[PDB]
Amino acid sequence: MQIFVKTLTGKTITLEVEPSDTIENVKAKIQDKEGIPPDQQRLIFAGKQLEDGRTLSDYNIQKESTLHLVLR
């Protein structure tokens, strides 16, 4: 049910979610941690690109795998 996210800051952040983890759902959860618009933010899972708020359970998300985002 948990989900792991890695930041270039090395700060470990944990979200309370279900495996459906819908990005509109996860993003909004992240909006609270830090301001990030879902319609503007996209994530990646095991090389797979997560969408605008598609469901993660459908993505067969695991025990809270770590998703990492990079732009450099």
From Swiss-Prot:
Description of post-translational modifications: Phosphorylated ubiquitin specifically binds and activates parkin (PRKN), triggering mitophagy. Phosphorylation does not affect E1-mediated E2 charging of ubiquitin but affects discharging of E2 enzymes to form polyubiquitin chains. It also affects deubiquitination by deubiquitinase enzymes such as USP30. Mono-ADP-ribosylated at the C-terminus by PARP9, a component of the PPAR9-DTX3L complex. ADP-ribosylation requires processing by E1 and E2 enzymes and prevents ubiquitin conjugation to substrates such as histones.
Domain of life: Eukaryota
Membrane-topology annotation of the record: Peripheral membrane protein
Ranges of residues in domain Ubiquitin-like: 1-72
Subcellular location: Cytoplasm; Nucleus; Mitochondrion outer membrane
Coiled-coil region(s): none
Function: Exists either covalently attached to another protein, or free (unanchored). When covalently bound, it is conjugated to target proteins via an isopeptide bond either as a monomer (monoubiquitin), a polymer linked via different Lys residues of the ubiquitin (polyubiquitin chains) or a linear polymer linked via the initiator Met of the ubiquitin (linear polyubiquitin chains).
Protein's name in the database: Ubiquitin
Organism expressing this protein natively: Homo sapiens
Residues of the full protein shown: 153 to 224 of 229
